[PDB]
């Protein structure tokens, strides 16, 4: 289906404990493929998926140099942000940034992204036009004016529409046997008595990729959103994901409940019931 390449940058100051750590991780969809960590003994862009390993030394050298420079740029940015908020040198602060591109099934650009947060709060974002910024507050307006003066949006647009999508398409081809393979969930319903009066029905989805899934319970054909406990989709550690949805049902009424599953790997959406 559709695909994305995204880089996730986290920089965290730690006064009294050295300079801020910078870590970058790169993903195609739900698959991490690179990391860089300034706290590594020998910081370097490192492969984290088999299909990226074939890239030549120029790829690793260029990304390592970009990331080493980024460590310094983010440290400067953290110093600037501390000043923009009149903050003390005593406290720890976090600067997060995510950027990258989305393509459709035809490989054509859907949209680009460049968004940042300071201490977990949205700070500045490149708008979908790839030409203007949205600043959260008067501090972020300083960054906006600085990026407007330096024509940063134009540089990001050129990257997002060219380099980013070209590399995403290349990764999708090199890793096609995994990145372009949707693995359906293995599904089943379990039954867990609570009392004489009620039991839990839990609908499981295991072994699926990518993480996007719809997993719901209906009673008599009516969706039970408020009454369903739906856990966050969680990684299994073998590239796949897991999820479950549970409802509390009165004893003897189990057959009024149906679990519904949709996922890209399924030839058809599933309907399941408890099968005692």
């Amino acid at each position: 289906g559709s695909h994305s390449m995204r880089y996730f940058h986290t920089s965290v100051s730690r006064p009294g404990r050295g300079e801020p750590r910078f870590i970058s991780v790169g993903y195609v969809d739900g698959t991490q493929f690179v990391r860089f960590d300034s706290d590594a003994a020998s910081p370097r862009t490192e492969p984290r998926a088999p299909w990226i390993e074939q890239e030549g030394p120029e790829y690793w050298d260029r990304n390592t140099q970009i990331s080493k420079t980024n460590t310094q740029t983010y440290r400067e940015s953290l110093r600037n942000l501390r000043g923009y908020y009149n903050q003390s040198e005593a406290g720890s602060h976090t600067l997060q940034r995510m950027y990258g591109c989305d393509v459709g099934p035809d490989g054509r650009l859907l949209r680009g992204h460049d968004q940042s947060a300071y201490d977990g709060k949205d700070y500045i974002a490149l708008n979908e036009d790839l030409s203007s910024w949205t600043a959260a507050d008067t501090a972020a307006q300083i960054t906006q004016r600085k990026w407007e003066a330096a024509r940063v949006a134009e540089q990001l647009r050129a990257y997002l529409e060219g380099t980013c999508v070209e590399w995403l398409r290349r990764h999708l081809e090199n890793g096609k046997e995994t990145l372009q393979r949707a693995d359906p969930p293995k599904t089943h319903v379990t039954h867990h008595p609570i009392s004489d009066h009620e039991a839990t029905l839990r609908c499981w989805a295991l072994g699926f990729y990518p993480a996007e899934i719809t997993l719901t319970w209906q009673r008599d054909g009516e969706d039970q959103t408020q009454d369903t406990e739906l856990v966050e989709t969680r990684p299994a550690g073998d590239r796949t994901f897991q999820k479950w949805a549970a409802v509390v049902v009165p004893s003897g009424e189990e057959q009024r409940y149906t679990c519904h599953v949709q996922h890209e790997g399924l030839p058809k959406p599933l309907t399941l019931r408890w099968e005692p």
Binding site: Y7, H9, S24, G26, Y59, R62, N63, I66, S67, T69, N70, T73, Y74, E76, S77, N80, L81, L95, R97, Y99, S116, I124, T143, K146, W147, A150, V152, Q155, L156, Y159, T163, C164, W167
Partner: peptide
């Protein structure tokens, strides 16, 4: 490939 970050 990544892009350079821009100073905030």
């Amino acid at each position: 490939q990544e892009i350079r970050t821009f100073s905030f």
